[PDB]
Design a protein around this ligand. Structure first.
Ligand SMILES: [Mg+2]
Ligand SMILES: [Mg+2]
Ligand SMILES: [Mg+2]
Ligand SMILES: [Mg+2]
Ligand SMILES: [Mg+2]
Ligand SMILES: [Mg+2]
Ligand SMILES: [Mg+2]
Ligand SMILES: [Mg+2]
Ligand SMILES: [Mg+2]
Ligand SMILES: [Mg+2]
Ligand SMILES: [Mg+2]
Ligand SMILES: [Mg+2]
Ligand SMILES: [Mg+2]
Ligand SMILES: [Mg+2]
Ligand SMILES: [Mg+2]
Ligand SMILES: [Mg+2]
Ligand SMILES: [Mg+2]
Ligand SMILES: [Mg+2]
Ligand SMILES: [Mg+2]
Ligand SMILES: [Mg+2]
Ligand SMILES: [Mg+2]
Ligand SMILES: [Mg+2]
Ligand SMILES: [Mg+2]
Ligand SMILES: [Mg+2]
Ligand SMILES: [Mg+2]
Ligand SMILES: [Mg+2]
Lengths: 73, 155, 119, 168
RNA sequence: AGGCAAGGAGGUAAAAAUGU
RNA sequence: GUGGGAGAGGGUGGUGGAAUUCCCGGAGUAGCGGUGAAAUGCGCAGAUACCGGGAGGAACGCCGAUGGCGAAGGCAGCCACCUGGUCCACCCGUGACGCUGAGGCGCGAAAGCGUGGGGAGCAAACCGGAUUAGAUACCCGGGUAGUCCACGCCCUAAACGAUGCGCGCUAGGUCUCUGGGUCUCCUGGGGGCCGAAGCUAACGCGUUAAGCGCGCCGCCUGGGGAGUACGGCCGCAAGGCUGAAACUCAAAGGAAUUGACGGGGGCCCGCACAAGCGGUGGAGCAUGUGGUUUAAUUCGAAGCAACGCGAAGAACCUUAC
C-alpha cells in the first residue's frame, strides 16, 4: 500500500518548475530512470503532474537520466 | 492424509539391544508376518558380523544405515504433457525407511544360500562403502543430478 | 589465444531460448553459449535448466581465456534468467554486479499479435 | 556421427588427412594439433575405427553445418504429401457432396493420398448398397484425376477407401 | 521477523462428430 | 468586463531518448528463431546474441489514475506559436437579449477509395508449415494492401451512460479532481461510489435521477420479412441515408428465480492418486460367464452396481432343458 518515507516529506522548500535544479529532481526519478507514483512522492495531483512535466523537460534537455539500469536485483 | 498429518507409528524398542531402528529393520526383513523367524535371522546376522568383522553388531548396522541414506530424491510429475523426474529433499524418517528398504532388497538380491548370512554380508558392504544398497543410493543421487533440471517445479 | 581476464556478461533472455554472450570490457565478445550448444533442442531450449547449463558453458569458455573480472547484464526475461545468473554466480567468476537492461520500448511500434492482447 | 577435435583426442599417434584430402601420414597427435592451429582450422577424429585413428584438419563447425544441411535436405525430399481423410455419410445430399468432391480434387492436385471413408450410424444394415453406391459414384467423378489404390474396407462403424493421384 | 497489497516476472490454463 | 486557474481541446512549426528494422564497421561460432510440441524460416557468402556509428519510418514507456479535456468522434514525449471551450471571485455593466431546434450548414473513430509521397514494425488478402477427419481457422514463418503524411472523398459504428437538450425543485455521506475563502472546516464547478424519499417489469436509479415537474425536439407502435426491395438523393466506387409491403408465425423479448449445465473458479472430502505392502495378467488347475458345439447345453443376471452370482450342495433327485 506504499508508506516508508515520502519524497515530498524528505525534501524541504523547492520550486517544481525549475528543471535546472537537477539533484533535487534526482530524488523523484527511480533507481532506473523512471518516475515514482503519486503514492511515493506524497504530492497533490496537480503538483504531481507539474513535477512530471518538469522531469520530461529535463529529459529533453538531458540532465536527468532517460532510462537506466537497476543494480543487484 | 487429507485432514491430519497421519502420524508415524512409534515402535516398541528392541528386546536384546534397545533401539527402534533395529525393530523397524526387522519388520522390513519380515515377510508373511513371521517376526520371530526374521528377528532370529537378524540376530544370526549380528552374530556373523561379530565373528568376521571384530565389532559390536549395532554400530556396524548404524554405519550401514548412514551409508545408504539419501538426501536428494526423485519424484514423477506430469507438467505440460511430458513426465519430468523432479528432484526434492527427503524428511529424515522417510529417508531412513528408504535406506532400510534398499538394504533389505540388497540382502534378497545376493548369490549365497542362507537368509542371515546374506543380510550380514550386505550390512558389512554398506559399512564399507560398497555393496548393493549403496550402489542404489548412488544411482538415486546421480538421478538427482542429471535431472536437477526440473527442481523449480517445487512440490 | 587472445586472453582478457575481464569484461561483461550479456544474458539475452527469451522464453524460447536464453542466450548468454561474454564480452571484453570494450564490448567485443570472446565467446557465447546457448541451448543448441548444450545439445538441447526445441522445448527444453528455454527450460531454466538449459539456461543454467548455457551459463555454465559460457563461464567455462571464458575461463579458457583467463577471465574472472565479470560485470553481468541481463536483457529481457526467459524461464531462467535468474537461474542463469545463479549459475554464473556459482561458477567461480568474479561477479561484480548483476544489472537489468531489458530492451523495453518507450512505447515503440506495434508488437506481434502474441505480444499484443496486452493493450 | 560426432567425433573428437584437437584437445578431446588423447590417443597418441593419429593418421592426418588434409582440408581437401591431403594425406600427411601416421603422425603425432600434438603435431596434428599444431598443423591445425597453423592453418586456422581443427583436427577432427573422422574415423576412430581404422589404422592409428583417421583424423581430418577441417573446419569442424563447417563440416557439422554441412551435415545438418544434408540431413535437412533428406527430410525435405522425403515428401510432405501424406494421407488426407474425408468422412462421408449415408444420406448425403447434393451440394455438400459436390463440396466434398472439390476438397478431394484439391487434395489430389496438391499431391496427397486420400482416405475416402463413409461414417455409418443407425441401421448400418442397408449400408453397402447405399454407401458402396456413393463410393462408386465418387470414384466415377474422379476417373481422370484419381486412381483407386484400395477398394472398400469395413472396419468399425465405417468403411474406408483410399485414392491416389492419376499421374505423378 | 510476520500481516495485507500494488507491480514485475515466470510456470499452469492449449487437446472432445458416430446410437435405441 | 475585470482579476485569475485547470487542462493529452485543436491546429501549425520543430525537436528528445528508449525501441525496432536496415546498412557499414568490429569482435566472435554452430545455431538462432519458433511451440501445447514441432515444422517451414533464416545461418558459414559467418546468421543469433554483443558493442561502435549511420540510415530511416512509426509511435510516445515511466508519470498514468478508478484521473484531466472536449459537443461528439476522440486526445497523451516536450517545446514554441496561433486558438476554442470552460471554471471561479468581484457582483461591476447590459436589461429577457433566452430555451429548444423541423429543415440547413458544419464536424464526425476505424476501415474504405481517389491523387501524390513515404514506408520501420505490424499486417487483411496472399504464399508457406503444422493442427486436424477436413483447415479456406485459432498457432508459428513470411507477405501485399493498408496502416503514416499532404489534398480530396466517404460518412457508418456497441458514434453507449445503450439514458436528447434546458432549468427549477427534492436527505445525507463518501472518495476524487479543480477554483475562491475568515484553509483541521466551508462554498462553487466537474468525475466516481454508497444510499432518504420517490420511481422502476425487475435489475437498478437515485443532486451527474431512470424522482417530481414543465419546455421543445427525436423516434416507437409484435417478431421475422428487412435496414432488404422499390423509387429518390447523395457518392469516383464500396455503400449510405430515406424506407415498405406481400407473405409468415403466435410469437420475438427483457428482468429476475429455481434448477440443471459449463474443456468457469474456490473450499473441501474418500485407499481416489501419491507413500507402501501384496497380489491379478503370464503357468496349471478350480470355478462363473461370453462365444461356439449340441438332441438340449434350461432360464435369468450386463460397466461400476453380471461374471465362486440366483444355487447355502446338479450323479438320480434337484430340474425348469
Ligand atoms: Mg478572463
Ligand atoms: Mg554485421
Ligand atoms: Mg449588477
Ligand atoms: Mg438598468
Ligand atoms: Mg442550440
Ligand atoms: Mg438537424
Ligand atoms: Mg510479420
Ligand atoms: Mg496446411
Ligand atoms: Mg494454410
Ligand atoms: Mg500470420
Ligand atoms: Mg490511401
Ligand atoms: Mg469518418
Ligand atoms: Mg460505454
Ligand atoms: Mg463510445
Ligand atoms: Mg443509438
Ligand atoms: Mg467532461
Ligand atoms: Mg460533486
Ligand atoms: Mg425505498
Ligand atoms: Mg446507487
Ligand atoms: Mg453526492
Ligand atoms: Mg423508465
Ligand atoms: Mg447498413
Ligand atoms: Mg436504389
Ligand atoms: Mg434473460
Ligand atoms: Mg440461473
Ligand atoms: Mg491406480
Amino acid at each position: 500500500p506504499s508508506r516508508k518515507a515520502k519524497v515530498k516529506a524528505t525534501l524541504g522548500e523547492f520550486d517544481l518548475r525549475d528543471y535546472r535544479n537537477v539533484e533535487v529532481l534526482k530524488r523523484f526519478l527511480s533507481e532506473t530512470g523512471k518516475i515514482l507514483p503519486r503514492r511515493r512522492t506524497g504530492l497533490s495531483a496537480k503538483e504531481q503532474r507539474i513535477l512530471a512535466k518538469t522531469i520530461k523537460r529535463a529529459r529533453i534537455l538531458g540532465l536527468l537520466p532517460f532510462t537506466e539500469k537497476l543494480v543487484r536485483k | 492424509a487429507r485432514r491430519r498429518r497421519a502420524e508415524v507409528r512409534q515402535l516398541q524398542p528392541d528386546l536384546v539391544y534397545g533401539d527402534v531402528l533395529v525393530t523397524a529393520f526387522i519388520n522390513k526383513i519380515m515377510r508373511d508376518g513371521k517376526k520371530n523367524l526374521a528377528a532370529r535371522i537378524f540376530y544370526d546376522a549380528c552374530k556373523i558380523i561379530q565373528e568376521k568383522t571384530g565389532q559390536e553388531p549395532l554400530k556396524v548396522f548404524k554405519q550401514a544405515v548412514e551409508n545408504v541414506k539419501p538426501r536428494m530424491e526423485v519424484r514423477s510429475r506430469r507438467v505440460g504433457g511430458a513426465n519430468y523426474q523432479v528432484p526434492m529433499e527427503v524428511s529424515p524418517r522417510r529417508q531412513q525407511s528408504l535406506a532400510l528398504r534398499w538394504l533389505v532388497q540388497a540382502a534378497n538380491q545376493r548369490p549365497e544360500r542362507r537368509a542371515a548370512v546374506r543380510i550380514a554380508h550386505e550390512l558389512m558392504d554398506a559399512a564399507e562403502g560398497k555393496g548393493g544398497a549403496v550402489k542404489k543410493k548412488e544411482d538415486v543421487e546421480r538421478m538427482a543430478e542429471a535431472n536437477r533440471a526440473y527442481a523449480h517445479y517445487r512440490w | 589465444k587472445r586472453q582478457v581476464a575481464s569484461g561483461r556478461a550479456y544474458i539475452h533472455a527469451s522464453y524460447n531460448n536464453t542466450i548468454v554472450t561474454i564480452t571484453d570490457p570494450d564490448g567485443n565478445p570472446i565467446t557465447w553459449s546457448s541451448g543448441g550448444v548444450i545439445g538441447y533442442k526445441g522445448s527444453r531450449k528455454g527450460t531454466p535448466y538449459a539456461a543454467q547449463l548455457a551459463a555454465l558453458d559460457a563461464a567455462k569458455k571464458a575461463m579458457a581465456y583467463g577471465m574472472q573480472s565479470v560485470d553481468v547484464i541481463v536483457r529481457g526475461t526467459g524461464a531462467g534468467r535468474e537461474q542463469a545468473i545463479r549459475a554464473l554466480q556459482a561458477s567461480g567468476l568474479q561477479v561484480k554486479s548483476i544489472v537489468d537492461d531489458t530492451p523495453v520500448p518507450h512505447n515503440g511500434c506495434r508488437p506481434k499479435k502474441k505480444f499484443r492482447k496486452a493493450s | 556421427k560426432e567425433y573428437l577435435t584437437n584437445e578431446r583426442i588423447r590417443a597418441k599417434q593419429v593418421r592426418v588427412v588434409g582440408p581437401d584430402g591431403k594425406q600427411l601420414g601416421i603422425m603425432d597427435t600434438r603435431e596434428a594439433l599444431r598443423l591445425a592451429q597453423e592453418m586456422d582450422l581443427d583436427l577432427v577424429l573422422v574415423g576412430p575405427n581404422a589404422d592409428p585413428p583417421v583424423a581430418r584438419i577441417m573446419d569442424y563447425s563447417k563440416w557439422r553445418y554441412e551435415q545438418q544441411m544434408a540431413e535437412k535436405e533428406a527430410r525435405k525430399k522425403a515428401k510432405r504429401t501424406e494421407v488426407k481423410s474425408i468422412k462421408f455419410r449415408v444420406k448425403i445430399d447434393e451440394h455438400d457432396y459436390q463440396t466434398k468432391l472439390g476438397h478431394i480434387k484439391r487434395f489430389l492436385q496438391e499431391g496427397h493420398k486420400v482416405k475416402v471413408t463413409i461414417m455409418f450410424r443407425g441401421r448400418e444394415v442397408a449400408h453397402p448398397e447405399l454407401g458402396e453406391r456413393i463410393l462408386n459414384r465418387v470414384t466415377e467423378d474422379l476417373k481422370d484425376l484419381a486412381v483407386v489404390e484400395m477398394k472398400p474396407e469395413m472396419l468399425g462403424r465405417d468403411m474406408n477407401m483410399l485414392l491416389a493421384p492419376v499421374k505423378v
